[PDB]
Amino acid sequence: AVSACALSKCAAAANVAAHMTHCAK
Ligand SMILES: [Zn+2]
3-state secondary structure of 16: helix
Q: Which helix (H) or strand (E) holds 10?
A: none
Whole-number Å distance, alpha carbon 13 to ligand 1 midpoint, is 12
Q: How far apart are CA 14 and CA 5, in angstroms?
A: 11
Cα distance between residue 25 and residue 11, in whole Å: 17
Q: How far apart are CA 4 and CA 15, in angstroms?
A: 13
Residue 18 CA to ligand 1 center (angstroms) comes to 8
> Near ion ligand 1, which residues have CB within 5 Å?
5, 10, 19, 23
Å from CA of 8 to ligand 1 middle: 6
CA angle centred on 25, ends 9 and 14, rounded to 5°: 30
15 CB contacts (<8 Å, ≥6 apart)? 2
Whether 15 contacts 1, CB under 8 Å? no
Rounded to 5°, the CA angle 15-13-20 comes to 20
